[PDB]
């Protein structure tokens, strides 16, 4: 990652232009250029890199930061007590993982019901009214309700209303063996969603763009969305209200509450510059104002500015919904939960599965523990000045497997076996301690079979296949006999590993 520069990653639905303005002010004072980017799937891309060209700062809801901290991707932020007192202590709790602060909290987010005051003067208090309301609106060429059915974030409040939950809290922590995805409450909620689609009140294909376009053109009376969505509605001709989500079975819809958070990349050489920008430029009245102006943040973590914005009824409604909802866990298993429920809702909504089938798989998938160990492997190969005439060897090479992160791989790896071509003596080379590598000379390329064994003999060994590369394929580097580096990134995946093995992997 380039030094004397800040690269920031924020999601494309947030005020990235507003953030850029805070970056320009930072550049004005320090001379340090801030580059704000909104890459697709940044929250999936971040671990793949973070890095070479990974960001200095990453923005997301707090739910994903626990997984990043487990992998060791985040720097422990070091805000002074004077600074911590300026933000709401609730927001600090959301960015804490294993007793340590791993991100700066920016703003509290919750979904609200947004409705067209011209089309729908009195919004419905219940989900159960919406079919009737839609039939009445369909007669006038309009629809009652359209929201993102592709992302479980938007459908969860309905699923959770009558008893759906992610992880049961027990013994002072989230119990990841107790998932609340296929109980009567969850089934009732998703069934109500599936029935809306079966009855033509909603369309399984509806995504963020379609719902937003539909509501903002006055085609649908209602949508479900967060504060970030208000800017585009302002630009439209729609008179909108932000209100409490409809009740289901007489119980409030329970949106998962998000704390938009800024993490500092552990690989960043600009940790001090990141601290300065986040503490003294973004998390200020003027800084949050520039971002909020672009796309509203919700209830900001900075007390001073939250008090200035608190009187906005749209924020009051946001916090009303937040209070009836649940703070998202930040634990690593939240990733698995979100993917499982995304599958369940899309399959149930499309009609590939029944509600019972879809939620039974999600129950299993949400509880499936996956531990990922990124690795690098391959070879370096150096050309001799000239061919050694005795055995015709032209190259010295090292084949190797290394952890991608700076860790002791021998904590979970028992041994690595490198199977060389028959032309070598003792072709089965076994390495029981690091470094996991074999150095040799030769004349020829050939496939090396690499077999990685784990301390738990029941944990199935990983087999890798590597073509030992001696000769450069690039023509200019071929003419120049330049040193060959053929190495590959890969991730070893451990599924529901034994208790012993989980400790060794973490």
């Amino acid at each position: 990652i380039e030094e004397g520069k800040l690269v920031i990653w924020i999601n494309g639905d947030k005020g990235y232009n507003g953030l850029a303005e805070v970056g320009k002010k930072f550049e004005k004072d320090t001379g340090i250029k801030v580059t704000v980017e909104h890459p697709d799937k940044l929250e999936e891309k971040f671990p793949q890199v973070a890095t070479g060209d990974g960001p200095d700062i990453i923005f997301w809801a707090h739910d994903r930061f626990g997984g990043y901290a487990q992998s060791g991707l985040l720097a422990e932020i070091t805000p002074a007590a004077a600074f911590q007192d300026k933000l709401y202590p609730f927001t600090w709790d959301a960015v804490r993982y294993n007793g340590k602060l791993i991100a700066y909290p920016i703003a509290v987010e919750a979904l609200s019901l947004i409705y067209n005051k011209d089309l729908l003067p009195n919004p419905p208090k219940t989900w159960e009214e919406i079919p009737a309301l839609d039939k009445e609106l369909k007669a006038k060429g309009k629809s009652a309700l359209m929201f993102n059915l592709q992302e479980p974030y938007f459908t969860w409040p309905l699923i959770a209303a009558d008893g759906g939950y992610a992880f049961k809290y027990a013994a002072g922590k989230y119990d990841i063996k107790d998932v609340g995805v296929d109980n009567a409450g969850a089934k009732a909620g998703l069934t109500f969603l599936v029935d809306l689609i079966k009855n033509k009140h909603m369309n399984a294909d509806t995504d963020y763009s379609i719902a937003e376009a539909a509501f903002n053109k006055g085609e649908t009376a209602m949508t479900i969305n967060g504060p970030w969505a208000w800017s585009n509605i302002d630009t439209s001709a729609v008179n909108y209200g932000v209100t409490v989500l409809p009740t289901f079975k007489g119980q409030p819809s329970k949106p998962f509450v998000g704390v938009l958070s800024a993490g500092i990349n552990a690989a960043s050489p600009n940790k001090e510059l990141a601290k300065e920008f986040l503490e003294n430029y973004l998390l200020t009245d003027e800084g949050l104002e520039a971002v909020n102006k672009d796309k509203p943040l919700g209830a900001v973590a900075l007390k001073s500015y939250e008090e200035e914005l608190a009187k906005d009824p749209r924020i009051a409604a946001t916090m009303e919904n937040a209070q009836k909802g649940e703070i998202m866990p930040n634990i690593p298993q939240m990733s698995a939960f979100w993917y499982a429920v995304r599958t369940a809702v899309i399959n149930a909504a499309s009609g590939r599965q029944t509600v019972d089938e879809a939620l039974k798989d999600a129950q299993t998938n949400a509880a499936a523990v996956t531990i990922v160990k990124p690795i690098v492997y391959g070879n370096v190969a150096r050309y001799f000045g000239k061919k050694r005439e005795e055995d015709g060897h032209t190259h010295q090479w090292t084949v190797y497997v290394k952890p991608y992160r700076n860790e002791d791989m021998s904590a979970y790896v028992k041994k690595i076996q490198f199977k060389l071509h028959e032309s070598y003596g003792n072709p089965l080379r076994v390495v029981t301690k690091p470094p996991y590598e074999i150095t040799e000379t030769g004349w020829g390329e050939f496939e090396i079979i690499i077999k990685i064994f784990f301390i738990d003999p029941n944990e199935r060994p990983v087999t890798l296949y590597h073509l030992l590369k001696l000769f450069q394929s690039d023509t200019n580097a071929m003419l120049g006999k330049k040193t060959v580096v053929s190495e590959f990134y890969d991730e070893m995946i451990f599924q529901d590993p034994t208790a012993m093995m989980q400790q060794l992997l973490t």
Partner: peptide
């Protein structure tokens, strides 16, 4: 254990 379903990336 297993390798990720996503193809290996050259570095």
């Amino acid at each position: 254990a297993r390798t990720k379903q996503t193809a290996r990336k050259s570095t």
